Design a protein around this nucleic acid. Structure first.
Lengths: 88, 70, 224, 164, 131
RNA sequence: CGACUUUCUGGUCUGUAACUGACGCUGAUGUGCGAAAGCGUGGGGAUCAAACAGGAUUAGAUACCCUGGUAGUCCACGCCGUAAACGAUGAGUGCUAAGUGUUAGGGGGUUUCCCGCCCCUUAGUGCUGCAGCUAACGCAUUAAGCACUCCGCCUGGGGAGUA
RNA sequence: CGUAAAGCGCGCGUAGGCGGUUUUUUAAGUCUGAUGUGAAAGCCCACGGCUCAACCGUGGAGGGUCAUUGGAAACUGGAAAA
């Protein structure tokens, strides 16, 4: 939808430390949850324009940040991709 | 604004009504059934946009006629 | 001269729109109007006093415009006391760059005043006399009493810029040093000898005109 | 502004047109002619005017020409430096030249520069070919032209450390 | 995203010329301080004053104007801009306005006016003319 | 995009500033959406309305005019993929006089209580206008000004968007 | 590139182009010096000789997006750190 409760719950395990709120690992995780949610609703409703526009924008941003973490660090990319089971 | 006195909202807020207070239905509407728009009442834009849907719902209740000409 | 107690008469201006170029003169707006500062007013007025007196020292000549209402009765008094030519009404199109018409105007005046002696009125049909009398009346009225304008002037005084754009622009075309009262709603940089003072007040304009007349007079009575 | 008939002068006409005003019935025309005026020693000015006849029109243009005047910052019989004039798409471009070259430009602008007392100068008209706009652009370029003394006073330093 | 800070400073300078205000504000930089110092050393800048606050800048400069309120330069622009960077040898270095103007140029030993750069026989990447 | 209520769902701004520390902008090719009309598939058709019928005007009117009137306008899924699709103004960033409003906010003072008032800050949303700019008209912080990066495009008209 | 021909309808975005602030570092670009080379004839300059010129000769300069190598590190670029 999403909900602040489940968001705040899931970010605690993926945050790099307790006090942080950025750390795109957090962002990649919440974006992945968001894209699955919107994709389920978009399969529920085949025709619309805001949904697919949104999905494309968030996928683009997720890829941009995922590529950003590919140059800052090299293990983080791997641990996230095989933990979220994403970016084949 | 050159319309009537501003800040008519001094007697209502933050949200209203929707149907339980005829004390702000009949003031803001005419005698034939028509709505009084913002120009004569002097109220704000937001309160007008709420009272619009409010009468839409209240005429649904049969508490209020769509048009009262007889 | 200027002193702060004489600066206490000046208060407020007309407030319909204010040019952002002269915020520096503004002290602090209050009661819904803008007021002009007075500390710089004394210094500027003292200076303009000095320049006007210097103009008078060499035997100068200055013009007085009073086209605005509630100023004429003071403008004529101070100019006639001053001993220099004067205006309180219509500035006919061109009076500092159209010299070929001013000479003919004063020449027509010199012509048509004198025929009253040898017989002008009733000495002929009603048609011409009724025309010439109204001609003389309107000429002296809307031109003024000025009949001594002979040598092109080197400085001018004005009552208001906002009404008198066309003449202040004509003077800029003739690169003459300009001095005159400056409302807070007028172009500052069109005038080089500024006086940030009020103009609506009858007493304010009266005192400013009296002081300027005394300045021009003091400078003229000395060897020129 | 401040016309003077005290210096020497050289009248010079650029173009004449037969210009018409159409009314019901006939067709009214009034000749036009532009002129440039200078003493070819460092002072120049252009002029325009219109009348029903040639001599009266050109006299009007000349008498209006002295009223607009140009200081013509000049040095060594050449402009101090190179510039580009621009006025209403009538662009123009000038550049100094070694002595013995001479003014090379279009007819009107040649007359403008020959009559402002410049001997050797390089330039080429651009954009529009109508005499009036390029002549006015040329004069505009001369208005915003500066010399070594005109700048050395402004900047805190002096001449002989910055010089052409 | 700002593509070029030199373009910003020169636009600020010219836009200060068109309305005439003694003071202007602009995020500083080491190259910016150096070129401001050379601007003051030519004579175009009345005074220079760097300040520090979080984080960079902000360089405050005091303009200069003639007694009749006349702008000193008649134009000001850059040459080396992104995409098409430019360079200049020692002999090939251009004399804009000759002595009149100067040609700011960055060299292997530092940024200097056009003159010294041709005197020492060391060129560099030009940045902006001024005149 | 203007009927209401709910279910699900995408975006925007302000403040905050704790946080990630340049991760940004433009962006060929590629992909998708894309007015109305038009088409495939099945219904529905109360109105309105191409084609068409009658009459009237009209030298003549298959046009306007009046009365009907099918497809169509409607729905559901696909199809196509142009337009004066405009602000005839490409996107992103920074700077440059003002005043006046409007929409959703914020800070402060004035009031026993601001909800009554004012000032200040935002962002859009307008107008009048200075500098400047333009063939001129006009643009003017919602630049067609002052610059930078990137993309698209033009190099006379007809031929011709034709082969 | 408002109206004159010229901003596609717009959106998501690859390749590419471009790049906030500071420090250290590399020296690829850049700047700078040398070395070899850019045939000769030709262009230009200077001189000389055909009676002069044309012409020819002589010598010089000039000519690389050139290679090697000695230095500089502001800027572009590479690396590392804020």
């Amino acid at each position: 939808a999403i909900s602040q409760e489940r968001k705040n719950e899931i970010i605690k395990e993926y945050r790099v430390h307790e006090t942080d709120t950025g750390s795109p690992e957090v962002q990649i995780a919440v974006l992945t949850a968001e894209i699955n949610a919107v994709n389920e609703h978009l399969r529920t409703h085949k025709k619309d324009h805001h949904s697919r526009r949104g999905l494309l924008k968030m996928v683009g941003r997720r890829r941009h940040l995922l590529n950003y973490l590919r140059s800052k660090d090299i293990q983080r990319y791997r641990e996230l991709i095989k933990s979220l089971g994403i970016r084949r | 604004r050159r319309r009537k006195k501003v800040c008519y909202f001094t007697a209502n807020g933050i949200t209203h009504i929707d149907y339980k207070d005829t004390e702000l239905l009949k003031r803001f509407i005419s005698e034939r059934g028509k709505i009084l728009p913002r120009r004569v009442t002097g109220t704000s834009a937001k309160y007008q946009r709420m009272l619009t849907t409010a009468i839409k719902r209240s005429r649904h209740m049969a508490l209020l006629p769509y048009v009262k000409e007889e | 001269m200027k002193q702060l107690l004489e600066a206490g008469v000046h208060f407020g201006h007309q407030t319909r729109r204010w040019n952002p170029k002269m915020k520096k003169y503004i002290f602090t707006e209050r009661n819904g109007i803008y007021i002009i500062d007075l500390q710089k007013t004394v210094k500027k007025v003292d200076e303009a006093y000095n320049f006007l007196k210097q103009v008078s020292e060499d035997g100068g000549q200055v013009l007085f415009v009073g086209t605005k209402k509630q100023a004429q009765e003071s403008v004529k008094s101070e100019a006639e006391r001053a001993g220099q030519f004067y205006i309180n009404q219509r500035w006919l199109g061109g009076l500092l760059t159209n010299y070929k018409t001013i000479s003919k105007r004063i020449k027509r005046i010199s012509e048509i005043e004198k025929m009253e002696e040898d017989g002008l009125f009733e000495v002929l049909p009603k048609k011409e006399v009724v025309e010439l009398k109204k001609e003389y009346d309107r000429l002296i009225k809307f031109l003024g009493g000025i009949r001594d304008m002979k040598s092109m002037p080197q400085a001018l005084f004005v009552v208001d810029p906002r009404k008198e754009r066309n003449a202040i622009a004509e003077a800029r075309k003739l690169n003459i040093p300009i001095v005159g009262i400056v409302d807070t709603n007028c172009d500052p940089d069109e005038i080089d000898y500024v006086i940030p003072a009020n103009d609506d007040a009858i007493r304010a304009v009266k005192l400013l005109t009296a002081k300027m007349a005394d300045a021009i007079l003091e400078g003229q009575q000395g060897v020129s | 502004r401040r016309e003077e008939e005290t210096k020497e002068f050289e009248e010079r006409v650029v173009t004449i047109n037969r210009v018409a005003k159409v009314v019901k019935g006939g067709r009214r025309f009034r000749f036009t002619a532009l002129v440039v005026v200078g003493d070819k020693n460092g002072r120049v000015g252009f002029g325009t005017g219109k009348a029903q006849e040639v001599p009266e029109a050109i006299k009007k243009a000349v008498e209006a020409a002295k009223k607009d005047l140009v200081v013509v910052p000049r040095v060594e019989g050449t402009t101090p430096h190179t510039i580009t004039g621009r006025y209403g798409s009538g662009s123009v471009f000038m550049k100094p030249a070694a002595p013995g070259t001479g003014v090379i430009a279009g007819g009107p602008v040649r007359a403008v520069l020959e009559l402002a007392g410049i001997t050797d100068i390089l330039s080429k008209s651009l954009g529009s070919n109508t005499p009036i706009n390029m002549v006015r652009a040329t004069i505009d370029g001369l208005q915003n032209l500066k010399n070594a003394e005109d700048v050395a006073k402004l900047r805190g330093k002096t001449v002989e450390e910055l010089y052409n | 995203t700002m593509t070029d800070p030199i373009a910003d400073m020169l636009t600020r300078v010219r836009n200060a010329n068109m309305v005439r205000h003694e003071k202007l504000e602009l995020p500083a930089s080491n190259i910016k301080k150096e070129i401001a110092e050379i601007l003051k050393s030519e004579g175009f800048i009345k005074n220079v004053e760097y300040v520090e606050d979080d984080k960079q800048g902000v360089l405050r400069l005091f303009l200069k104007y003639g007694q009749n309120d006349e702008r000193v330069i008649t134009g000001l622009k850059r040459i080396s801009k992104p995409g098409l960077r430019v360079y200049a040898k020692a002999s090939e270095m251009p004399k804009v306005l000759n002595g009149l103007g100067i040609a700011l140029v960055s060299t292997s030993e530092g940024v200097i006016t056009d003159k010294e750069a041709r005197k020492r026989n060391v060129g560099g990447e030009i940045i902006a003319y001024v005149w």
